[PDB]
Design a protein around this nucleic acid. Structure first.
Lengths: 103, 185, 180, 201, 35, 147, 128
RNA sequence: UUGUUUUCACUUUCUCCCCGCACUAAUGUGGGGAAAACUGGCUUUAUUUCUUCAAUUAUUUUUUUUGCUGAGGA
RNA sequence: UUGGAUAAGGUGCCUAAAUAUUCGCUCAUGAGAUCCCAUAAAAGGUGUUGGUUCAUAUGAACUAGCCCUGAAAAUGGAUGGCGCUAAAGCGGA
């Protein structure tokens, strides 16, 4: 009905890390219907929006979004690395992210 | 090691078979036949006007390429046994006490006494639908019978191992319950 | 072409001779033909065999030409011949060999996996000898006769392997094992 | 992964493979409800797994077995513990992932009629050679002292009967909906008819 | 280039004959040593 | 020295457990690998695990060795010679028009429908939506009528 | 003989091979840095121009990267003034990785060290 | 102290026949023979978009979608 | 510091990356599982497979990979854990 989507679903996994060592500059993100590196490469220029809600208003609104974009694929199972303006807080691991259709 | 391993059985003329899901349904004279063989990888080719069963194993490597041989002789003996009842030849054995038999309840719940003078209760069973009963020719003989190989065979198997005594040398104390030979009706 | 299925061997033939000396004015030219992972590996193996069978090495051996001589028709079906010699943890043993692939290149590789899987003989412990061609009725192996049988068939006891794209995690209902 | 919750039928599923898949899903944030955990299969002989569980049973804190490893003989609890062993339950995120899992024996009330999914990567029929030995988690639990196996079976058969009747109703509903489609189609205009035919609808 | 490939046929068939005759003499020596 | 009608009938009534004879001359569609989506006739059997598959050049796919592990073949068959080469390969195939009789089976029809549904553009996607909308309208009105 | 004998002693810690013209041209054009300063004060500098090549070698008539690839590939009358003039190439790790730095390229098992001969071109342009 | 040549034995088939005569996994098979050779290879002819023209290497020229970076201020 | 790409080592989960592909071997009623490394021997082996040797599709003798016996210790217990057998084990590619 209302509230058109025009974006693809993603889930924020942890950071770009090794065993017992993290690099919070890049965050791993899994996209809804991608399971191969070749298909994950289809989303590179696309912007990524992490839209979360706060307990109180900040600009008359209770919703804050932080922006990033997918830089490359991670692994060969359709997982991408995304770089955001500010580092994703680890409390957001497992949360929903929007892979937008633009550019 | 190779790919197709199978035997062309010769179906007895006195039976009529059919197959479904490795469950073979057969009819002879005494009755009908089925069995669960789902522990083995087995396929079947079958004919009825031209007959003969073929139980086939594909890509059978030799460790399990003997499952086939077992069943190929086994089922071939199955229809023959159900047509002509398989008769082993067991003698009740005693060196001192001629054996006491209280065969209550129509071949079911057989009893054994007069075996080392304990004068207590002992009873080993058999398969239903299989007979192991006194031969009127000699009291020391119980003729076995049945229709299946295993039917006529466990009923001769479970018995040798039921009333065994203690602290006696079998090399001189020759007590037992012997099974010797196999014949047919 | 499938790189996952592929080995990495082509034909070589590099012509030379042992070093001519004042002592031996005109040493005879010689030759030998093998295959390995690449041309440099083949040269190293050739010089190893030269040192082991005769007395000459890189230091006293040179060459005068080199070429790559592909086969007559790459996509044929062949029956060629070699023999094997390998050492175990306690001795040394030998046999012959002939396996069927398309051509010579991959003919060697199927045997290495077989030896590694059955006798745990690493490739450094295996020597293959005398590449030639074999007949078809002369096989004394339980398998290779029915390779060239007039007419043969077997079923598809295949267990499915699909693309990673369709290898989905949650299935609606349990898949079967008949296919076709 | 992107559903509100996934209901998994654990029948004919290998315990460790199922637990690994479930643990990764839980860590990524997907809620999982595992039903019919008493039909989980384990590779290896029933006596082998019996020996393994007796080795686990003889294990306890000598000073105070109250503090020792709890043994949790119900098959659902066995699957739960196996899953917990595959995630970092000592951390806050790992504890959340662990609590995001529900395990049941049989199918309780709010799982009669939601879709039950299956992980083919853990099915016995695809992961085990047919000639090789396997066991059943319900039987193993009954051998180590669960003693609720028969009741679960008798509840399961009643569930089977209810589902049989309601599926029999559903197929009639579906075929009636199909036969009304037939003359809903030819009464529709040809330009829509052709699109529907050529796109397989 | 027909003539060039013919000359290469000659060059490689010389190698094939050499390998064949090496095989032949190896077999002859083995058969002599067989007993 | 032949048995006629029973020989013809009981063979059809046999209901064997496996099918799709792997005789050389069949066709195939690969199930795993870069060629999953390309058609190849079956050439011979090299080993238990490897086979050789080869599409007609009209299909445009080569003679190639593939493990049997990656295969879902075709039911059709041509009658080429054992030494039939790719001058007769392009003739035997259009002699019988072998491919056409597969894309009328259920799996082939499903595959074609899925392929063209994937290739569908946005406008025809909306046309599908609109047609389903009208069909649903008609479903509802005649379902109300059926009372 | 001298360089080959001295290289044989570091053989297990290096991999070397035949460069070929395209690879040496690529190395000089995209990874070529040059020692510009006065004696023992060289101050590494990317080529970017022919001026310093002419300043240090033009009086020796080798002015130009065109002239200098033609001198490195065919081992001409001047290596003392081209190889020494070049700063040691600082290469990236291989794009697709090594096989095993621990083992020789000539072993049947995967390995890296030793003489690759002609097979070093792919390694160089993968490390470049 | 070798080159060189000669000798036979092989291959396509839904060919066919006979014996077991259905014993075939099949719309055949185990054995013995006749067939042409619809297989194939060979030598040509004009064409390679009807259909292949590959793979590797050497030597070159591009191209799709995109991540990060912007020191300096002559 | 920002990006890229790797070494050693790994890619079932813990744990980033293969329930990857491809070829074999192995069932253990105390399987096995990364140098140092965290023990194992003599002695026994008609399962597998390639063997090797000799006797007229016919027998043995050897040989060697995996598996088993040999193989018993004290708080409860450790291939790191879970677990794993169409391996997530062993030997390759």
């Amino acid at each position: 009905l209302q509230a058109v989507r025009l974006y693809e679903k993603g889930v924020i996994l942890g950071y770009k890390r090794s065993q017992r060592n993290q690099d919070p500059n890049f965050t791993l993100i899994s996209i809804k219907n991608v399971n191969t590196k070749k298909h994950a490469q289809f989303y590179v220029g696309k912007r990524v929006a992490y839209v979360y809600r706060t307990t109180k208003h900040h600009d008359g609104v209770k919703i804050k979004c932080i922006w990033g974009k997918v830089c490359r694929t991670h692994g060969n199972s359709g997982v991408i690395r995304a770089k955001f303006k500010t580092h994703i807080p680890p409390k957001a691991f497992g949360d929903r992210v929007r892979i937008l259709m633009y550019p | 090691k190779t790919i197709v391993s199978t035997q062309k059985v010769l179906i007895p003329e006195g039976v009529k078979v059919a197959i479904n899901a490795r469950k073979v349904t057969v009819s002879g004279k005494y009755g009908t036949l089925r069995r669960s063989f789902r522990h083995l990888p087995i396929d079947i080719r079958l004919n009825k006007l031209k007959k003969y069963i073929k139980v086939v194993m594909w890509f059978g490597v030799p460790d399990s390429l003997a499952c086939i041989r077992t069943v190929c002789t086994h089922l071939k003996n199955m229809f023959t046994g159900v047509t002509k009842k398989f008769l082993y030849k067991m003698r009740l054995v005693h060196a001192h006490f001629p054996i006491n038999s209280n065969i209550v309840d129509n071949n079911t719940r057989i009893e054994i006494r007069n075996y080392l003078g304990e004068k207590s209760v002992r009873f080993v069973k058999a398969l239903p639908g299989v007979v192991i009963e006194k031969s009127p020719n000699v009291k020391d003989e119980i003729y076995v019978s049945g229709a299946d190989i295993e039917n006529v065979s466990l009923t001769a198997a479970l018995i040798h191992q039921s009333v065994l005594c203690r602290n006696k040398d079998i090399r001189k104390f020759l007590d037992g319950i012997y099974v010797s030979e196999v014949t047919t009706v | 072409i499938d790189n996952s299925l592929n080995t990495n061997i082509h034909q070589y033939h590099i012509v030379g001779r042992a070093i001519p000396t004042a002592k031996d004015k005109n040493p005879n030219v010689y030759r030998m033909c093998i295959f390995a992972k690449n041309d440099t590996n083949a040269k190293s193996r050739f010089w190893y065999f030269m040192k082991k069978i005769n007395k000459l090495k890189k230091s006293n051996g040179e060459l005068l030409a080199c070429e790559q001589i592909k086969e007559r028709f790459p996509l044929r079906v062949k029956n060629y011949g070699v023999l094997l010699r390998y050492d175990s943890r306690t001795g040394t043993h030998n046999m012959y060999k002939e396996f069927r692939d398309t051509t010579k290149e991959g003919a060697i590789a199927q045997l290495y996996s077989e030896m590694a899987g059955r006798h745990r003989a690493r490739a450094s412990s295996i020597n293959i000898i005398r590449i030639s061609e074999i007949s078809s009725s002369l096989v004394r192996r339980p398998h290779i006769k029915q390779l060239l049988k007039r007419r043969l068939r077997f079923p598809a006891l295949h267990l499915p392997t699909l693309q990673k794209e369709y290898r989905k995690k949650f299935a609606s209902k349990r898949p079967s094992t008949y296919r076709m | 992964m992107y559903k509100k919750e996934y209901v998994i039928d654990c029948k004919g599923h290998l315990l460790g493979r199922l637990a690994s898949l479930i643990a990764k899903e839980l860590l990524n944030g997907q809620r999982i409800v595992a039903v019919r955990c008493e039909d989980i299969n384990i590779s290896g002989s029933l006596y082998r797994n019996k020996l393994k569980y007796q080795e686990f049973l003889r294990l306890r804190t000598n000073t105070n077995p109250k503090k020792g490893p709890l043994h949790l003989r119900e098959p659902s609890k066995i699957l739960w513990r196996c899953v917990r062993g595959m995630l970092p339950h000592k951390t806050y995120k790992g504890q959340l992932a662990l609590k995001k899992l529900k395990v049941c024996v049989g199918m309780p009330y709010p799982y009669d009629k939601k879709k039950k999914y299956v992980l083919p990567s853990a099915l016995r029929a695809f992961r085990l050679k047919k000639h090789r030995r396997y066991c059943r988690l319900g039987t193993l639990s009954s051998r180590v002292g669960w003693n609720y196996d028969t009741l679960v079976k008798k509840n399961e058969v009643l569930r089977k009967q209810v589902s049989k009747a309601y599926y029999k109703k559903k197929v009639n509903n579906l075929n009636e909906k199909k036969e009304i489609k037939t003359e809903a189609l030819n009464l529709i205009n040809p330009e829509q008819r052709q699109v529907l035919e050529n796109f397989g609808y | 280039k027909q003539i060039q490939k013919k000359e290469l046929q000659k060059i490689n068939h010389d190698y094939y004959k050499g390998v064949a005759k090496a095989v032949k003499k190896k077999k002859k020596r083995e058969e002599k040593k067989a007993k | 020295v032949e048995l006629t009608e029973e020989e013809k009938l009981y063979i059809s009534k046999k209901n064997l457990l496996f099918k799709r004879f792997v005789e050389p001359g069949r066709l195939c569609l690969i199930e795993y690998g870069p060629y999953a989506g390309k058609l190849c006739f079956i050439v011979d059997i090299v080993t238990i695990t490897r086979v050789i598959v080869d599409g007609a050049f009209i299909t445009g796919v080569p003679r190639m060795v593939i493990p049997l592990k990656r295969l879902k073949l075709l039911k059709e068959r041509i009658k080429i010679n054992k030494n039939c080469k790719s001058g007769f390969l392009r003739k035997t195939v259009n002699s019988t028009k072998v491919l056409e009789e597969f894309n009328n089976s259920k799996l082939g029809k499903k595959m074609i429908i899925k392929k063209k549904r994937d290739e569908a553009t946005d406008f025809e996607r909306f046309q599908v939506y609109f047609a389903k909308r009208e069909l649903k309208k008609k479903m509802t009105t005649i379902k109300n009528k059926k009372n | 003989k001298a360089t080959k004998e001295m290289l044989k002693i570091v053989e297990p810690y290096v991999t070397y091979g035949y460069p070929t013209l395209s690879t040496v041209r690529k190395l000089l054009y995209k990874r070529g840095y040059v020692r510009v300063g006065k004696v023992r004060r060289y101050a590494r500098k990317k080529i970017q121009d022919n001026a310093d090549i002419s300043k240090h070698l033009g009086k020796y008539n080798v002015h130009g990267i065109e002239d200098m690839v033609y001198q490195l590939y065919t081992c001409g009358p001047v290596f003392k003034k081209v190889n020494n003039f070049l700063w040691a190439f600082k290469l990236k790790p291989p794009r697709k990785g090594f096989k095993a730095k621990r083992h020789a390229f000539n072993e049947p098992r995967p390995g890296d060290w030793g003489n690759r001969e002609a097979h070093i071109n792919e390694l160089i342009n993968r490390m470049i």
